[PDB]
Every structure is written in structure tokens, then in C-alpha cells.
């Protein structure tokens, strides 16, 4: 059916979790890591 | 039907929220304001 995102390829559940992880789950922690890195006192 | 409070007047949802607000939502905060007012040290 064409009412939902699906995948006929192997392990189609991988995009189901990797797209949220890379794009709106991990990026804020990654920004926090970089922000701490670029603000550290000498 | 006469199994519930209803209103044929305009904006009958107003008593639905205004009666709880004046009578058992806001009065305790109001009493808190008055209690602080009448106990303040000189």
C-alpha cells in the first residue's frame, strides 16, 4: 500500500529509526558537544 | 436532554469553565495572596 513509508529492501526498519536518530534525536546532543568544545576556557 | 448541565444561551461553554475558576480553582491562590498580604513584616 502507498499510504505509509515502507521498504521492500532488507531491514526496512533501519530507516525507520536511523532517520529520526541522525536528524532530530542526536543532532542536539552533537551541537551540545561542539558548543562545550568551543566554549572551554584555556 | 436533561441529564447534563447545558446552555442554550450564547457561549454556553463560559459557565463550564468560569464556575470552576471562580469557585474552586482561583480562590485558594487568592487566599494565598491575602495571607501573604496580612502576614508581611513591617
Amino acid at each position: 500500500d502507498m499510504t505509509q513509508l515502507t521498504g521492500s529492501y532488507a531491514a526496512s526498519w533501519l530507516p525507520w529509526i536511523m532517520i529520526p536518530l541522525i536528524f532530530y534525536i542526536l543532532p542536539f546532543p552533537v551541537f551540545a558537544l561542539i558548543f562545550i568544545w568551543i566554549e572551554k576556557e584555556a | 436532554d436533561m441529564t447534563q448541565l447545558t446552555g442554550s444561551y450564547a457561549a454556553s461553554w463560559l459557565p463550564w469553565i468560569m464556575i470552576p475558576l471562580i469557585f474552586y480553582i482561583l480562590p485558594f491562590p487568592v487566599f494565598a495572596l491575602i495571607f501573604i498580604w496580612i502576614e508581611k513584616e513591617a
Binding site: - | Y9, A10, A11, L14
Partner: protein
């Protein structure tokens, strides 16, 4: 035919004017 929703809302907004002026008078009398 009683008043409409707009009339009730207008009265609520209009009543704010004596509401604020009552607060101004009450605090002024407290001085």
C-alpha cells in the same frame, strides 16, 4: 432572541476597563 457570542465577548472586553480602573482606585485609596 438573546445576545450572540460576539456581544458576550465584547462585554467581557468592555468590563476590563472598569476592572482596571477599580484596581487603580483601590490602590490609590490604600495610600
Amino acid at each position: 432572541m438573546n445576545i450572540s457570542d460576539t456581544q458576550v465577548f465584547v462585554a467581557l472586553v468592555v468590563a476590563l476597563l472598569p476592572g482596571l480602573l477599580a484596581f487603580r482606585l483601590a490602590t490609590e485609596l490604600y495610600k
